[PDB]
Design a protein around this ligand. Structure first.
Ligand SMILES: Cc1c(C(=O)O)cccc1-c1nc2nc(N)nc(OCC3CCCCC3)c2[nH]1
Ligand SMILES: [Mg+2]
Lengths: 262, 300
C-alpha cells in the first residue's frame, strides 16, 4: 500500500544510491587524525548506542549521527578530549532531524557528565552544520534495509532485527566498515541475517533492485560474518546488550553460523 | 557559498511568522532579487524546523520548488536566501474574485504543483503543509512549493512521524483518524483541496476543529465504511457513533468543474490512502491534455 510508496520506491532507492556516494566519509581519515584512533571512535559510537537507548531514540538517529561524525572527522582534526563533544553535537543534530520528540540540549549536556558546557555543545552544533554545509539528509544502512525487507517471503521479524543488529555492529569498527557503502553493508547484513535464521539467500528480486550479487557482496559479507562471530569478545558490548531486548526479538542471543558456504 | 550580506539591500518586509521575518532584497552586484528569511538564534540552538528546511531544500532542485540560493550562517543570525516570487496563491485567489481564475491558469498551476510534489516524493520528502499561503507565483506563470519547515525525509516503508501535522483545512482523513502511519497521499489530499479552492476561491473543508473537519469531509464525500476504505472502522479515532452521511454527486461538490476535472479531483480526494492517486500518475490525467503555461491574468 501507500506506506511502501509503490509509485516512488524505485526513484527513492536510485536517489539514495546516488547520495550515499556523495555523503560517504573519507575511507582513510583516521590515519590523518594525529590524536584519535579507530579504538576511540569505537568507544564513542558505543557510547552513542547507550545514549540512544537511554533516550529511546530511533536507530535511524544513531546511524545519522555516526555519518555526521565520520564526515566531520574526514576534514577536521579533533583532539581526543573533544571527540565526545563532536559526538554529542552530532547526536543532537541527528535527533533534531529525525525525532518527533528530540531530547533537549540540557539532556545532551547532562549525558556528557558535565565534561562540556551547554555553550560548547551549541557552538559545536553550529560548527558541525557549517562543516557539513547543512547536508543532513544522509542515507543510512537502515534506509536501505527497510526496503530490502520488503522482498522477504514472508516477512520474518527475527530476520529484520538481526539484520539491523549486524548493520549496527558495523558502525563501531571504522576498520573495515568505512570502505563499504550503506547499501552494501545493508545487503550483506540482510543476506547474513536471512541465512542465519532461515537458511535462505539474497534473493533474485534484490539482485534486480540493487544490481548486487553474492559475488559483489562477498568481501563485505566475509568481514560482517567475522564481526558477527567475534561479537561476544569485542571490547564494545552496548549493541549486543541492546539487541537482547524483546523489542528486537533477542536476536543478539542467536548463534552465528559457523560457515557461509559461498 | 555566494558570500554574503553586505551585498544585499533590503527593499521591504514581505512576510512574517517564525523565526521569522522575510524581506525582499536585491543583490547589489548581480541585480538578483531575493527573499531573505531571517531566523533569530537564541537557548536550544538551531531550530529543528530550520535544520529540516535547509537540509531538505538543498537536495530539492526543481522549477516548481522554491530555490534556496544560499545560507548565511552567523553566530546569532541565520539568513536563508531564496529566489524571489511575487505573490502567494491565496492573495492571487482574492485578487481574482469577480472573474475567478481562468481555467487555463488553474490547470497550469495544478500541473506544476503536481510536478513539484512528485519530485519531492521521488526524493523521499513529505511536505506536510500544502496550502495556498505556501504556494508562490511569479509573473511568468510559475507556481512553486514553498515553506518546507514542516517537511520530513521519509523512509520506505514509512515509520510513525509527527501527528500534528498539516493546516487543518487541508489535512487528510487518515491524519484526522489517527492512523499510525501516513504517507505521500497526505500531500495529494492537500492539493485536491487546493484544486477545488482555485476553482471556487473558497476552502473546500473549512473546519473549526478536528471533529468538525472530519464531519465536513464526511458530509461532502460520504461517511467512509469498510467498503470504501477497508480498515477505517478500526482506526484509533474512528467512532462507531459517527453520523453516516450519504456521498453526494461530485458534480455537486464543484459544480463548474468539467468531467475530466471532476474525475481527477475525485481521485485526489479518495478516502483510502492506498487508492488515492499519486502526483506521478496525476500528471497523466486527461484533465491535462491541453495544458499550457500562461502568465497570470492580473498584475502581481
Ligand atoms: C508572499 C508575498 C507577497 C504576498 O503575497 O503578500 C508579496 C510579495 C512577496 C511575497 C513573497 N515572495 C516570496 N518569495 C519567496 N521565495 N519566499 C517568500 O516567503 C517565504 C514564505 C512562503 C510562504 C509561507 C511563509 C514563508 C515570499 N513571499
Ligand atoms: Mg496513494
Amino acid at each position: 500500500g501507500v506506506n511502501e510508496v509503490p509509485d516512488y520506491h524505485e526513484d527513492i532507492h536510485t536517489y539514495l544510491r546516488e547520495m550515499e556516494v556523495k555523503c560517504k566519509p573519507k575511507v582513510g581519515y583516521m590515519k590523518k587524525q594525529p590524536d584519535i584512533t579507530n579504538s576511540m571512535r569505537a568507544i564513542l559510537v558505543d557510547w552513542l548506542v547507550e545514549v540512544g537507548e537511554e533516550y529511546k531514540l530511533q536507530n535511524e538517529t544513531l546511524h545519522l549521527a555516526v555519518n555526521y561524525i565520520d564526515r566531520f572527522l574526514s576534514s577536521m582534526s579533533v583532539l581526543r578530549g573533544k571527540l565526545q563533544l563532536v559526538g554529542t553535537a552530532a547526536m543532537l543534530l541527528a535527533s533534531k532531524f529525525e525525532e518527533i520528540y528530540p531530547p533537549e540540549v540540557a539532556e545532551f549536556v547532562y549525558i556528557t557528565d558535565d565534561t562540556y558546557t551547554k555553550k560548547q555543545v551549541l557552538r559545536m552544533e553550529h560548527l558541525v552544520l557549517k562543516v557539513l554545509a547543512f547536508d543532513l539528509a544522509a542515507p543510512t544502512i537502515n534506509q536501505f534495509l527497510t526496503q530490502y525487507f520488503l522482498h522477504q517471503q514472508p516477512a520474518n521479524c527475527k530476520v529484520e532485527s538481526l539484520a539491523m543488529f549486524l548493520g549496527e555492529l558495523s558502525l563501531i569498527d571504522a576498520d573495515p566498515y568505512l570502505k563499504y557503502l550503506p547499501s552494501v553493508i545493508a545487503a550483506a547484513a540482510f543476506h547474513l541475517a536471512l541465512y542465519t535464521v532461515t537458511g535462505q539467500s539474497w534473493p533474485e528480486s534484490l539482485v534486480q533492485k540493487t544490481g548486487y550479487t553474492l559475488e559483489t557482496l562477498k568481501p563485505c559479507l566475509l568481514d560482517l560474518h567475522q564481526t558477527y562471530l567475534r561479537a561476544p569478545q569485542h571490547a564494545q558490548q552496548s549493541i549486543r546488550e541492546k539487541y537482547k531486548n524483546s523489542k528486537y526479538h533477542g536476536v543478539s542471543l542467536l548463534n552465528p553460523p559457523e560457515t557461509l558456504n559461498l | 557559498p555566494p558570500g554574503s550580506m553586505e551585498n544585499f539591500q533590503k527593499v521591504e518586509k514581505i512576510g512574517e511568522g517564525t523565526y521569522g521575518v522575510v524581506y525582499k532584497a536585491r543583490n547589489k552586484l548581480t541585480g538578483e532579487v531575493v527573499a531573505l528569511k531571517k531566523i533569530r538564534l537564541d537557548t536550544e540552538g538551531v531550530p529543528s524546523t530550520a535544520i529540516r528546511e535547509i537540509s531538505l531544500l538543498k537536495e530539492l532542485n526543481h522549477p516548481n520548488i522554491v530555490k534556496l540560493l544560499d545560507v548565511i550562517h552567523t553566530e546569532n543570525k541565520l539568513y536563508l536566501v531564496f529566489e524571489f516570487l511575487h505573490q502567494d496563491l491565496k492573495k492571487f485567489m482574492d485578487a481574482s474574485a469577480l472573474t475567478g481564475i481562468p481555467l487555463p491558469l488553474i490547470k497550469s498551476y495544478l500541473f506544476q504543483l503536481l510536478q513539484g510534489l512528485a519530485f519531492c516524493h521521488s526524493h523521499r520528502v513529505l511536505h506536510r503543509d500544502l496550502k495556498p499561503q505556501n504556494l508562490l507565483i511569479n509573473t511568468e506563470g510559475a507556481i512553486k512549493l514553498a515553506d518546507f519547515g514542516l517537511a520530513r525525509a521519509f523512509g520506505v516503508p514509512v515509520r510513525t512521524y509527527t501527528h500534528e501535522v498539516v493546516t487543518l483545512w487541508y489535512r487528510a482523513p487518515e491524519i484526522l483518524l489517527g492512523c499510525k502511519y501516513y504517507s505521500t497521499a497526505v500531500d495529494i489530499w492537500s492539493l485536491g483541496c487546493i484544486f477545488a479552492e482555485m476553482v471556487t476561491r473558497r476552502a473546500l473543508f473549512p473546519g473549526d476543529s478536528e471533529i468538525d473537519q472530519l464531519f465536513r469531509i464526511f458530509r461532502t464525500l460520504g461517511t467512509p465504511d469498510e467498503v470504501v476504505w477497508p480498515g477505517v472502522t478500526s482506526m484509533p479515532d474512528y467512532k462507531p457513533s459517527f453520523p453516516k452521511w450519504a456521498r453526494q454527486d461530485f458534480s455537486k461538490v464543484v459544480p463548474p468543474l468539467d468531467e475530466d476535472g471532476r474525475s481527477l479531483l475525485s481521485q485526489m480526494l479518495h478516502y483510502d490512502p492506498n487508492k488515492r492517486i499519486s502526483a506521478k500518475a496525476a500528471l497523466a490525467h486527461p484533465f491535462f491534455q491541453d495544458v499550457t503555461k500562461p502568465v497570470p491574468h492580473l498584475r502581481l
